[PDB]
Design a protein around this ligand. Structure first.
Ligand SMILES: CN(C)c1ccc(S(=O)(=O)N[N+](=O)[O-])cc1
Ligand SMILES: CN(C)c1ccc(S(=O)(=O)N[N+](=O)[O-])cc1
Ligand SMILES: [Zn+2]
Length: 258
């Protein structure tokens, strides 16, 4: 009886196995754009993805992860609210059963069709498993998806999904350039939070871009053909794999932009 996104194992149940679900710095949150304050002492983000080395794509039964070689500073996030160097390890998405839901963060209560998470770990902690035990261990760059024009840089991901339909399937996924998933502007909101899936560790500096990317209805429809189940088991479409907004508690959301 493991955690998931059903009625009987979804977000409202996670606190039983993971009591930090009710903690002081949980994610996602609603971003109230009129309450977020411009912080002129933030810097610009530095997203350095030119030497990124993608390796594999995995259906883990909750989402799919595009995994990177993180054994050197090949693809790193720095600047903005961050001190030091954060190495890209994987990205994944959260998405809905229909276009009006799917994002984890919300903006003035607006839900986007999906949300991309580029996960990075603080190299001062040496490995990812050590980093998740630290309050400044991870930096997640979150990017909203809206349905409209196709995103050309997403299509290589879309087309490999047929090969990883079910939980536990992987495929080689080399030479994928995550720069093709970025919007034009790097304006962002930032706040201290958590993983949005169990174990819900409070180790993340969230950096949520203001500008969504556009993907086509056909692209998101292909996400919705994935399965939560394993091969040879009854089909459960991988949709609505998002955690709703959590209480902001004693946090401030800061804006990089006026
Ligand atoms: C040789 N064939 C049949 C083949 C090759 C690649 C693809 S793909 O769309 O890049 N990947 N995929 O499906 O998972 C599909 C079919
Ligand atoms: C420790 N790793 C596995 C990890 C960290 C953070 C995330 S997330 O971007 O907060 N989304 N999510 O939790 O579902 C995902 C994975
Ligand atoms: Zn995520």
């Amino acid at each position: 009886h493991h955690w998931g996104y059903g009625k009987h194992n979804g977000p409202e149940h996670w606190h039983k196995d993971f009591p930090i679900a009710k903690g002081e710095r949980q994610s996602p949150v609603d971003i109230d754009t009129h309450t977020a304050k411009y912080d002129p002492s933030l810097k610009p983000l530095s997203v350095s993805y030119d030497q990124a080395t993608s390796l594999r794509i995995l259906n883990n039964g909750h989402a799919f992860n595009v995994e990177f070689d993180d054994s050197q500073d090949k693809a790193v996030l720095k600047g903005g609210p961050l001190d030091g160097t954060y190495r890209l390890i994987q990205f994944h998405f959260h998405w809905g059963s229909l276009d009006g839901q799917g994002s984890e963060h919300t903006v003035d209560k607006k839900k986007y069709a999906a949300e991309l998470h580029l996960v990075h770990w603080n190299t001062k902690y040496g490995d990812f498993g050590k980093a998740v035990q630290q309050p400044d261990g991870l930096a997640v760059l979150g990017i909203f998806l809206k349905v409209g024009s196709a995103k050309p840089g997403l299509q290589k991901v879309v087309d490999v999904l047929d090969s990883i339909k079910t939980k536990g399937k992987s495929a080689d996924f080399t030479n994928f350039d995550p720069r093709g998933l970025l919007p034009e502007s790097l304006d962002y909101w930032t706040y201290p939070g958590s993983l949005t899936t169990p174990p819900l560790l409070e180790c993340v500096t969230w950096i949520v871009l203001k500008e969504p990317i556009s993907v086509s209805s056909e692209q998101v429809l292909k996400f919705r053909k994935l399965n939560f189940n394993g091969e040879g088991e009854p089909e459960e479409l991988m949709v609505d794999n998002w955690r709703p907004a959590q209480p902001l508690k004693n946090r401030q959301i800061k804006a990089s932009f006026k």
